Amino acid sequence: KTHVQLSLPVLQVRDVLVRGFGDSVEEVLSEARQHLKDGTCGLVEVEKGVLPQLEQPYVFIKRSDAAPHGHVMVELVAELEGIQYGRSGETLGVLVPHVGEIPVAYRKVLLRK
Ligand SMILES: NCCc1ccc(O)c(I)c1
Structure with missing residues (x-):
């Protein structure tokens, strides 16, 4: 499917223990x-x-x-030193690894995949 319905822990x-996904865009x-597919994305x-x-x-x-x-x-847009890779709308927030932190809410999204 071009889109997947996800419920992301906010x-x-x-509280975030792993504060990014890596070192390059x-x-x-x-x-x-990968984390969005495995259900390990906050x-x-x-x-x-x-x-x-x-x-x-x-x-x-x-x-x-x-x-x-x-x-x-x-959709996903990456940012490094003030430059964005992808063009899209209003930010719903920043994605991070989820390693069992307790959320304050869930955010329902349809992810362009
Ligand atoms: N074709 C890959 C399947 C898949 C399922 C859920 C997801 O959130 C994502 I990204 C990919």
């Missing part, structure tokens, strides 16, 4: 996709002071369109 930035997009909502507490390159989920079955349609 994590507090200070291509690696972080690859790892983010979401941090971006507010003042969040991104400096996480590791670059960043992987964002961004709105790709305007929401089936309650799931907002999203």
Whole structure:
């Protein structure tokens, strides 16, 4: 399928134990996709002071369109040193590995895969 319905755990930035997916734009997009498929991906909502507490390159989920079955349609955009790889809509947040942190909420998305 071109899209997959996911329910992503929303994590507090200070709880996140593994604060990025890797060291290059291509690696972080690859790892983010693998973690989304394996159900081991969390979401941090971006507010003042969040991104400096996480590791670059960043992987964002961004709105790709305007929401089936309650799931907002999203795609992945990576960011390194102020340059973005991909073009999309409003940031829903930053993806990180999930290693069992307790979420504050779940965010339903339809991921372009
Ligand atoms: N064709 C790969 C299957 C798959 C399932 C769920 C996902 O979240 C993702 I990304 C890929």
